[PDB]
Coordinates of C-alpha atoms and ligand atoms in Angstrom, one line a residue:
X30 CA 114.6 124.5 103.4
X31 CA 116.9 121.7 102.5
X32 CA 116.0 120.3 99.4
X33 CA 117.9 117.4 98.0
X34 CA 119.9 118.3 94.1
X35 CA 121.2 115.6 92.0
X36 CA 124.8 116.1 89.5
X37 CA 123.4 117.6 85.9
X38 CA 123.4 114.3 84.5
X39 CA 121.2 112.6 87.0
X40 CA 119.0 115.1 86.8
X41 CA 118.6 115.1 83.1
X42 CA 118.1 111.4 83.2
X43 CA 116.6 110.7 85.8
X44 CA 112.8 112.1 84.2
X45 CA 114.1 109.3 81.2
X46 CA 112.0 105.9 81.7
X47 CA 115.4 103.7 80.9
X48 CA 117.8 105.8 83.4
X49 CA 120.0 103.5 85.5
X50 CA 120.4 104.4 89.0
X51 CA 124.2 103.2 88.4
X52 CA 126.7 101.7 90.5
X53 CA 127.4 103.5 93.5
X54 CA 125.0 102.2 95.9
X55 CA 125.7 105.0 98.7
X56 CA 124.0 107.6 96.1
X57 CA 120.7 105.1 95.8
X58 CA 119.0 106.7 99.7
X59 CA 119.0 110.3 98.1
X60 CA 118.3 109.1 94.5
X61 CA 115.2 107.6 96.4
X62 CA 114.6 111.0 99.0
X63 CA 115.1 113.3 95.5
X64 CA 112.0 111.2 93.5
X65 CA 109.9 110.9 96.5
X66 CA 110.1 115.0 97.1
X67 CA 109.3 115.6 93.4
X68 CA 106.6 113.2 92.7
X69 CA 104.8 113.5 96.6
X70 CA 106.4 116.4 97.7
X71 CA 108.8 118.5 100.2
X72 CA 106.8 117.8 103.0
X73 CA 105.2 114.2 102.4
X74 CA 107.4 112.8 104.7
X75 CA 109.7 114.3 107.6
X76 CA 113.5 113.5 106.8
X77 CA 115.0 112.4 109.4
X78 CA 112.2 109.4 110.3
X79 CA 112.3 108.3 105.7
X80 CA 116.0 108.7 105.7
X81 CA 115.6 106.2 109.0
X82 CA 112.7 104.1 107.0
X83 CA 114.6 104.2 104.2
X84 CA 118.2 102.6 105.8
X85 CA 116.2 100.0 107.6
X86 CA 114.6 98.6 104.5
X87 CA 118.2 98.2 102.9
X88 CA 119.5 96.7 106.0
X89 CA 116.4 93.9 104.9
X90 CA 117.7 93.1 101.4
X91 CA 119.9 90.1 101.3
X92 CA 122.7 89.7 99.2
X93 CA 121.5 88.4 96.1
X94 CA 122.7 88.2 92.6
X95 CA 119.2 90.2 91.6
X96 CA 116.3 90.1 94.4
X97 CA 118.6 93.1 96.0
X98 CA 118.4 96.9 97.1
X99 CA 119.3 97.7 93.8
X100 CA 116.1 96.1 92.1
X101 CA 114.4 97.8 94.5
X102 CA 115.0 101.2 94.0
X103 CA 114.9 100.1 90.2
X104 CA 111.1 99.4 90.4
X105 CA 110.9 102.5 92.5
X106 CA 112.3 104.6 90.0
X107 CA 110.5 102.9 87.2
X108 CA 107.0 103.8 89.5
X109 CA 108.7 107.6 89.6
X110 CA 108.5 107.9 86.2
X111 CA 105.2 106.9 85.3
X112 CA 103.3 109.3 88.2
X113 CA 105.4 111.8 87.0
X114 CA 104.1 111.5 83.3
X115 CA 100.6 111.0 84.6
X116 CA 100.2 113.5 87.6
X117 CA 96.5 114.8 87.2
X118 CA 95.7 110.7 87.3
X119 CA 96.9 109.5 90.7
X120 CA 95.6 110.8 94.5
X121 CA 97.7 112.3 97.3
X122 CA 97.6 109.4 99.1
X123 CA 98.2 106.5 95.9
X124 CA 101.8 108.8 95.6
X125 CA 102.9 108.6 98.9
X126 CA 102.1 104.8 99.1
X127 CA 103.1 103.5 95.5
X128 CA 107.2 104.4 95.8
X129 CA 107.4 103.2 99.4
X130 CA 105.4 99.9 98.0
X131 CA 108.2 99.8 95.1
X132 CA 110.6 99.8 97.8
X133 CA 109.6 97.6 100.0
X134 CA 108.0 95.2 97.1
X135 CA 110.7 92.4 97.5
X136 CA 111.5 92.5 101.6
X137 CA 114.0 89.6 102.8
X138 CA 113.8 87.7 99.6
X139 CA 116.1 84.9 99.5
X140 CA 116.2 84.7 95.5
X141 CA 113.8 81.2 95.4
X142 CA 110.2 81.7 93.6
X143 CA 106.4 80.3 95.2
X144 CA 106.9 77.0 93.5
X145 CA 110.9 76.2 95.5
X146 CA 109.2 77.7 98.9
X147 CA 106.3 75.4 98.3
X148 CA 108.6 72.1 97.3
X149 CA 110.6 72.8 100.1
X150 CA 108.1 72.5 102.7
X151 CA 109.3 76.1 104.2
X152 CA 107.7 77.8 106.8
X153 CA 106.9 80.6 104.6
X154 CA 104.4 77.9 102.6
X155 CA 102.3 76.6 105.6
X156 CA 101.3 80.6 106.9
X157 CA 101.0 82.1 102.9
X158 CA 99.3 79.4 100.3
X159 CA 99.3 81.6 97.4
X160 CA 101.4 84.4 96.7
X161 CA 103.9 83.2 99.8
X162 CA 106.2 86.0 99.3
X163 CA 104.3 88.3 98.7
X164 CA 102.4 88.1 101.9
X165 CA 105.9 88.1 103.8
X166 CA 107.7 91.2 101.5
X167 CA 103.9 92.9 103.4
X168 CA 105.0 91.3 106.5
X169 CA 108.5 92.9 106.6
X170 CA 107.2 96.1 105.8
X171 CA 104.6 96.5 108.6
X172 CA 107.5 95.4 110.8
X173 CA 109.8 98.0 109.8
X174 CA 107.1 100.5 110.2
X175 CA 106.2 100.1 113.3
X176 CA 109.5 100.0 114.7
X177 CA 110.4 103.4 117.1
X178 CA 110.8 106.4 114.4
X179 CA 110.1 104.6 111.2
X180 CA 106.6 105.3 111.3
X181 CA 106.8 107.5 108.1
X182 CA 102.7 108.1 108.1
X183 CA 102.6 109.9 111.3
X184 CA 100.7 112.8 110.3
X185 CA 97.8 110.7 108.2
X186 CA 94.6 110.0 110.4
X187 CA 93.9 106.1 111.3
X188 CA 91.3 105.9 108.0
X189 CA 94.0 107.1 105.8
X190 CA 96.9 105.0 107.0
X191 CA 94.7 102.0 107.1
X192 CA 93.8 103.2 103.2
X193 CA 97.4 103.7 102.0
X194 CA 98.7 100.2 103.9
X195 CA 95.9 99.0 101.8
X196 CA 97.2 100.3 98.6
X197 CA 101.1 99.4 99.6
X198 CA 99.6 95.5 100.7
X199 CA 97.6 95.3 97.1
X200 CA 100.8 97.2 95.0
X201 CA 103.1 94.3 96.4
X202 CA 100.4 91.4 96.3
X203 CA 100.5 92.3 92.6
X204 CA 104.1 91.6 92.1
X205 CA 103.1 87.7 92.1
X206 CA 103.6 87.5 88.2
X207 CA 100.7 84.1 88.9
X208 CA 98.6 87.2 89.3
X209 CA 99.6 89.5 86.5
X210 CA 98.0 87.2 83.3
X211 CA 94.3 87.1 84.8
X212 CA 94.8 90.6 85.8
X213 CA 96.4 92.6 82.7
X214 CA 93.0 89.5 80.6
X215 CA 90.6 91.9 82.8
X216 CA 92.1 95.4 82.1
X217 CA 92.1 94.3 78.2
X218 CA 88.5 93.3 78.2
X219 CA 87.9 96.8 80.0
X220 CA 89.5 98.5 77.9
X221 CA 88.3 96.8 74.5
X222 CA 84.2 97.4 75.6
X223 CA 85.0 100.9 77.0
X224 CA 83.8 99.9 80.8
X225 CA 87.0 100.5 83.0
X226 CA 86.4 103.4 85.3
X227 CA 89.1 105.2 86.6
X228 CA 86.7 106.6 89.5
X229 CA 86.2 103.1 90.2
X230 CA 88.5 101.8 93.2
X231 CA 88.4 98.0 92.1
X232 CA 89.3 99.3 88.9
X233 CA 92.3 101.5 89.8
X234 CA 93.7 98.7 92.2
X235 CA 93.5 96.6 88.6
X236 CA 95.7 99.6 87.1
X237 CA 98.4 100.0 90.0
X238 CA 98.5 96.3 90.0
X239 CA 99.7 96.7 86.0
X240 CA 101.9 99.5 87.3
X241 CA 103.1 97.4 89.5
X242 CA 104.4 94.6 86.3
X243 CA 105.3 97.0 84.5
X244 CA 107.9 98.6 87.2
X245 CA 108.8 94.9 88.4
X246 CA 109.7 93.5 84.8
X247 CA 111.4 97.1 84.3
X248 CA 114.9 95.3 83.1
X249 CA 113.3 95.2 79.2
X250 CA 112.7 98.5 79.1
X251 CA 116.0 99.3 79.5
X252 CA 118.8 100.2 77.0
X253 CA 120.2 97.1 75.7
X254 CA 123.7 97.0 77.5
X255 CA 121.8 97.1 80.9
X256 CA 119.2 94.9 80.1
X257 CA 121.5 91.6 78.8
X258 CA 124.1 92.7 82.1
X259 CA 120.3 92.3 84.3
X260 CA 119.3 89.1 82.2
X261 CA 122.8 87.4 83.7
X262 CA 122.0 88.4 87.4
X263 CA 117.9 87.2 86.9
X264 CA 119.6 84.1 85.5
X265 CA 122.2 83.4 88.5
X266 CA 119.3 83.5 90.8
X267 CA 117.1 81.1 88.2
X268 CA 120.2 78.5 88.0
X269 CA 120.6 78.7 91.6
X270 CA 117.1 77.1 92.1
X271 CA 117.4 75.0 89.4
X272 CA 120.2 73.3 91.6
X273 CA 117.6 73.4 94.6
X274 CA 115.2 71.4 92.5
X275 CA 117.5 69.2 91.8
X276 CA 119.1 68.3 95.3
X277 CA 115.4 67.7 96.1
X278 CA 114.8 65.3 92.8
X279 CA 112.9 67.3 90.7
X280 CA 113.4 68.1 87.6
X281 CA 113.5 72.1 87.2
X282 CA 112.0 73.8 84.7
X283 CA 114.2 74.7 81.6
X284 CA 114.6 78.8 82.4
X285 CA 115.9 76.9 86.1
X286 CA 118.2 74.2 84.6
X287 CA 121.8 76.0 83.7
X288 CA 123.1 72.9 81.0
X289 CA 120.5 74.8 79.5
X290 CA 122.6 77.9 78.8
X291 CA 122.7 78.1 75.2
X292 CA 118.6 78.3 74.6
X293 CA 118.8 81.6 76.8
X294 CA 118.4 83.9 73.8
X295 CA 114.8 81.7 72.6
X296 CA 113.7 81.7 75.9
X297 CA 113.8 85.7 76.7
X298 CA 112.0 85.0 72.8
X299 CA 108.8 84.0 74.8
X300 CA 108.9 86.0 77.8
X301 CA 108.9 89.0 75.6
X302 CA 106.4 87.7 73.3
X303 CA 103.8 85.8 76.4
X304 CA 104.7 88.4 79.1
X305 CA 106.4 91.6 78.6
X306 CA 105.3 93.0 75.5
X307 CA 101.7 92.5 76.6
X308 CA 102.3 94.1 79.9
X309 CA 103.6 97.1 78.2
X310 CA 101.1 97.5 75.4
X311 CA 98.1 97.2 77.9
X312 CA 100.0 100.0 80.2
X313 CA 100.1 102.4 77.0
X314 CA 96.6 101.7 76.4
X315 CA 95.4 102.8 79.3
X316 CA 98.2 105.6 80.3
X317 CA 99.5 106.8 76.8
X318 CA 102.4 108.6 78.1
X319 CA 104.2 105.8 79.5
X320 CA 104.4 104.7 75.3
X321 CA 108.8 104.3 76.3
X322 CA 108.9 101.7 78.1
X323 CA 106.9 99.8 75.0
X324 CA 109.6 101.5 72.8
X325 CA 112.5 100.0 74.7
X326 CA 110.5 96.7 75.3
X327 CA 110.2 96.1 71.2
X328 CA 113.7 97.6 70.4
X329 CA 114.7 94.4 73.5
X330 CA 113.1 92.0 71.9
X331 CA 114.6 93.4 68.2
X332 CA 118.1 92.9 69.7
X333 CA 117.3 89.4 71.7
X334 CA 116.2 87.9 67.4
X335 CA 119.7 89.3 66.2
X336 CA 121.1 87.4 69.1
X337 CA 119.3 84.2 68.4
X338 CA 120.5 84.4 63.8
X339 CA 123.9 84.9 65.4
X340 CA 124.6 88.5 64.6
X341 CA 125.2 89.6 68.5
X342 CA 126.8 86.9 71.0
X343 CA 125.3 86.6 74.7
Ligands
JQL29 C1 109.2 86.9 87.3 C2 110.6 86.3 86.9 C3 111.2 86.9 89.0 C4 112.5 86.8 88.0 C5 111.8 87.9 87.3 N1 111.3 86.8 86.4 C6 110.9 87.2 85.3 O1 110.4 86.6 84.2 C7 111.8 87.8 84.8 C8 112.0 89.3 84.6 N2 113.0 90.3 83.7 N3 113.0 89.0 83.2 C9 114.0 89.8 81.7 C10 113.2 88.0 83.2 C11 113.2 87.1 82.6 O2 114.2 86.7 81.8 N4 112.3 85.8 82.4 C12 112.3 84.5 81.5 C13 111.3 83.6 81.5 C14 110.5 83.1 80.9 N5 112.3 82.3 80.8 C15 112.3 80.7 80.1 C16 113.6 81.0 79.8 C17 114.8 79.6 79.1 C18 114.0 78.8 78.6 C19 114.5 77.5 78.1 C20 115.7 77.8 78.1 C21 116.2 78.6 78.8 C22 115.8 79.8 79.9 N6 114.4 82.2 80.1 C23 113.2 82.6 80.6 C24 113.5 83.9 81.0
MG30 MG1 108.7 89.8 94.6
ZN31 ZN1 110.6 92.6 92.1

C-alpha cells in the first residue's frame, strides 16, 4: 500500500483537539486523506476517486474571509479528533459519512447568513424557506458526488449509499445554528432524565447534530492566538453583511455593525455564555473524551474577560 505520512510535529499534534492545520493550503488535502485513512480505514475509499472528490470540493469553496476551504478542513479535523477519541461508538457508515459531511458542510458559501438571503429576496430563499444555505450546501455535495469519477461511495449497496447520504444531509442541515438551540435542549433533557439511547436512530441523529455544531464552532477551542486571529475573519464577514443590510435600508444587528467594533470583547463573552460553553458542556456529558474542547473553550472565555478588563488588547 501507499500510506499517507505527515511530518513528525503534525503526526503528533493532529491527534490534539486544538491542532491548527497551518497556512500551507497545498498540505490540507493530504491532511484530510491522512485523517480518513486513520478514522475510517485505507480501504474505505479508492484514493484516485477521493483525491478527485477533494479537489472538486476545494474548487466549489469561495475566496471569502471565514466560510472558506480552510474552515471546511478545520471542521473535518475537529470531527476526526471526536471520532478517534470515541472510536467504539460510531458505525462504519457514520465514519465514512461524517468527515465527508464536514468537508462539504459550507460548499459555495458567499459569506452571508440565511437572514440576509431572506431580506435580499435571493432565489435560494424561494427554493429553501428554512436552513436556506445548508440545503444549498447539501445540494452542492450531491452535484459533486454525481460528477464522472467522483462516486467515492461506489462500493456501497443502493440502501447503504442512501443511508450515508441521509447521515450527510442531516449532519449538514444540523450546522444551521438556528436548529442547535432546540437540539441541545432536547439532548440536555434526555441526558438528565437518563432516556438518551444511542441504539435509537433519532437519538443518534441529535448526538451527530451536536457533534456538527461542536466541530463548526471549534475556533473557540483552539489556543488563544488561533481563537483571536480567527475572530478577525468571522467579523470581516459579519461586517460585510452589515454593510449589505445598510444598503437594503435595514439596521444590522450589533455583531454585523463595523461601527460597534469596540464592543467585540463583550459580544464574545455573550456568545461563549449563551452558545459555546453550553454546546461543549452537553457534548462532554454525552462523550466524556471530548472534555478538552470544553476546557479550551473555558480558557478562551477567561481570555475575553481579560480583554474586557484591559489586561489584553484586541
Ligand atoms: C453562527 C455564525 C456563523 C459564522 C460563525 N458564527 C458564529 O456565531 C461564531 C462561530 N465562532 N464564533 C467565535 C462565532 C462568533 O464570534 N459569534 C458571535 C455571536 C454573537 N456576537 C455578538 C457580538 C457583538 C455584539 C455587540 C457588538 C459587537 C459584537 N459578536 C458576536 C459574535
Ligand atoms: Mg454553515
Ligand atoms: Zn461552517
